[PDB]
Symmetry: D3
């Protein structure tokens, strides 16, 4: 049987949805306190007792983090439609290359509402 | 690989357990601040960038919601034994017909205790 | 210096004096949070105003009266609003916990009430 | 006796008067929490200081002005810090809710601000 | 399709990591407010409407609980390297024998960081 | 107007002056929450009482003394109750943050302590 590990970051940005019908609240400029969850799966080095470091995880994420934190998302190439579904994937795509063990990504824009890409 | 989405509602009702041994706290009339989590899986329309709406999800749930919120659960046909296990299913059963993408239902009666039916 | 301790208990209530078919008038329930908070000086030796276990015991009677119960049944709780209810709690505990200074009650996660003094 | 009600709304803002390329000066956003809290006596009959639904309605105008909006656009919110912002809210509501006694605003989960009186 | 159930406990202990490079914050004596989640899967007795009791679950866990709560973890045989990965497993191992339905164990040492063994 | 900022740090402690084999006397630990809160007037131009980053820096020394450490080792923290501990923190920070008005410490999620003034 298997072990997975998981780490939460939060960040602050503004976004808007380009393709919502004209009235929709969601297409007005607005913002959120997003939460992101990286999750990794793999083996547990018998010496460190770790799937992986974390210092190493943080710093691998960080440049991707910094691009979103306290920023407007539609200006980031890839996120012209900054939906949770689109964003969760956008992350997977940036970090999967530098974190091979990336198992799944989760994005919550509100307390009460989220998204999990694999 | 695949994307799932998820939405939290909370509601207020009273319930009691019909079949607990005579002393049990749980068979006295009492109530809870329940939390319910609908989760859907499916594809991400390339134009909307959405698995589905939400306004559309909310309103599809709503009649089922309204029947539980600020109500006593044993009076609802189906919930004569308003356990989490029984309730989580009871929901699946009402909403799966109107939300084909329903992937799983979660019911938490306390902060610290829940149930996930699929 | 003030301390404060928090408890959830799980119960039912309806409000009797509410309009027509208003939804708080239908027998419902909530997961409630109660916060006793107390003010005194720390013992220069224990480093404590009270245990937190001295507290627990002194509450426990009132606590099991409410947890997993229906509130309207409880003399003094005909009409169990947050306001009635926090006050009622204060009346029960102030005798057994003289240092006690506030009682806070929350029905839901987002509403709540403080009965000070 | 005090009551308090809590609301999240979801919005964008940037701070105009901040150094160089400081990160709060880049157009960002937050999930905000607002807490109105009010002080009065309970009706000896309703058991209430106010509904919580009387409240909701009296706020609702100001609330939809902020939710899902950009704040700098809102006259009086050029410079939307927590401090500016809680005060601004107080100025809008104190007229419509005279019992109102504090306004608390939180940008993030861990920072926040109370504008009393 | 299937029902799983889940229960949260929290506990207080101190631990340190034996095998971190010399500076690391993590190898200094420190402690945490850990959270543990037992999760069970099985069938729902049609009379009780329960996968299982809980009173029965609690008390089956309890001796294992008591050994960790308000204790230093490196002194417990098995936990000489009290990492989340190692600890989550350590639990599985103690409770799986007395709770056959144990489906998965979760350990969170901070609000923002955890581990799920199966 | 008051602001408040929140920090978790992760540490160990035991209480020396506690009965027999009482469980707080066994070397344990907690995830602690510290809340500095401060009261002053907002700058009519910045819209701020303080940064939140001016704060962070002024705390940081005391903060890394506690985070990931054992508390009984720290002069003045023989006997690290919440009460001792919040006060101790106040004594360290009030010099570096004169506007500071409360310090709140929480051992667990449900207990806690405020050292005002
Ligand atoms: Zn949005
Ligand atoms: Zn129940
Ligand atoms: Zn109610
Ligand atoms: Zn900001
Ligand atoms: Zn640690
Ligand atoms: Zn302790």
């Amino acid at each position: 049987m298997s072990t997975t590990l998981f780490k939460d970051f939060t960040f602050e940005a503004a976004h808007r949805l380009p393709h919502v019908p004209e009235g929709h609240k969601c297409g007005r400029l607005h913002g959120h306190s997003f939460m992101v969850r990286l999750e990794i799966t793999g083996e547990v080095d018998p010496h460190t007792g770790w799937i992986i470091d974390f210092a190493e995880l943080k710093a691998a994420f960080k440049p991707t983090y910094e691009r979103l934190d306290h920023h407007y998302l539609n200006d980031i190439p890839g996120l012209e439609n900054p939906t949770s579904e689109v964003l969760a994937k956008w992350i997977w795509d940036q970090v999967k290359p530098v974190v091979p063990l990336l198992s799944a990504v989760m994005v919550k824009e509100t307390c009460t509402a989220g998204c999990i890409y694999r």
